[PDB]
């Protein structure tokens, strides 16, 4: 995106990877460009997850940002399934409810964007045994650990949150990239500008 790079963020290759503090406008931009890329290149499908279904109630809306700059691709949503010159390219899904979603096939995943990962912040409504849920959407999607990655995206800064909790990630704060072997949480200061 203009202000938001995700190329150092990706180079780490960690299959986990956690944005947040992130200002409103590039990094879920960038999270729609970099897989409808890799799709078109390399035919890698992609998989947008929210926790709710309401959240994804405007998601036949989800090509617009991105629209102007695949001019000359078709990119069309019908459902919760995105499509990429007449090609099945991508899934929306609720957390909420994966279990559903199993029953249907995805041949060759290699991205998940986990947008607004964070109860932000008003309540812990986060669903039970959820870092389970997301991990089983994970190992039932990605075939191995080779260039797959999950990327949660976030506008809040809550530290401690169940994947943090869970993974057992403590962050510095002071720092853009705290790496794990496994694992990359990105604070971006792509906004500020002085």
Same mark, same amino acid.
């Given at each position: 995106?203009?202000?938001?790079?995700?190329?150092?963020?990706?180079?780490?290759?960690?299959?986990?990877?956690?944005?947040?503090?992130?200002?409103?406008?590039?990094?879920?931009?960038?999270?729609?460009?970099?897989?409808?890329?890799?799709?078109?290149?390399?035919?890698?499908?992609?998989?947008?997850?929210?926790?709710?279904?309401?959240?994804?109630?405007?998601?036949?809306?989800?090509?617009?940002?991105?629209?102007? /700059?695949?001019?000359?691709?078709?990119?069309?949503?019908?459902?919760?399934?995105?499509?990429?010159?007449?090609?099945?390219?991508?899934?929306?899904?609720?957390?909420?409810?994966?279990?559903?979603?199993?029953?249907?096939?995805?041949?060759?995943?290699?991205?998940?964007?986990?947008? /607004?990962?964070?109860? /932000?912040?008003?309540?812990?409504?986060?669903?039970?045994? /959820?870092?389970?849920?997301?991990?089983?959407?994970?190992?039932?999607?990605?075939?191995?650990?080779?260039?797959?990655?999950?990327?949660?995206?976030?506008?809040?800064?809550?530290?401690?949150?169940?994947?943090?909790?869970?993974?057992?990630?403590?962050?510095?704060?002071?720092?853009?990239?705290?790496?794990?072997?496994?694992?990359?949480?990105?604070?971006?200061?792509?906004?500020?500008?002085?």
């Amino acid at each position: 995106s203009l202000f938001y790079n995700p190329q150092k963020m990706l180079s780490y290759d960690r299959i986990l990877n956690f944005v947040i503090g992130a200002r409103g406008i590039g990094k879920s931009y960038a999270m729609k460009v970099y897989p409808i890329n890799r799709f078109i290149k390399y035919g890698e499908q992609f998989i947008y997850v929210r926790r709710y279904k309401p959240e994804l109630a405007k998601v036949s809306n989800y090509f617009n940002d991105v629209a102007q /700059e695949f001019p000359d691709h078709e990119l069309v949503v019908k459902g919760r399934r995105f499509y990429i010159d007449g090609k099945l390219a991508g899934w929306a899904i609720p957390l909420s409810v994966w279990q559903s979603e199993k029953s249907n096939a995805y041949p060759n995943v290699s991205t998940i964007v986990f947008d /607004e990962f964070i109860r /932000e912040k008003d309540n812990s409504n986060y669903i039970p045994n /959820e870092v389970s849920a997301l991990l089983n959407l994970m190992d039932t999607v990605f075939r191995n650990r080779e260039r797959v990655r999950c990327i949660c995206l976030s506008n809040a800064v809550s530290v401690v949150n169940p994947y943090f909790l869970f993974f057992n990630l403590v962050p510095d704060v002071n720092k853009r990239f705290n790496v794990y072997d496994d694992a990359l949480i990105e604070i971006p200061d792509s906004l500020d500008f002085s």
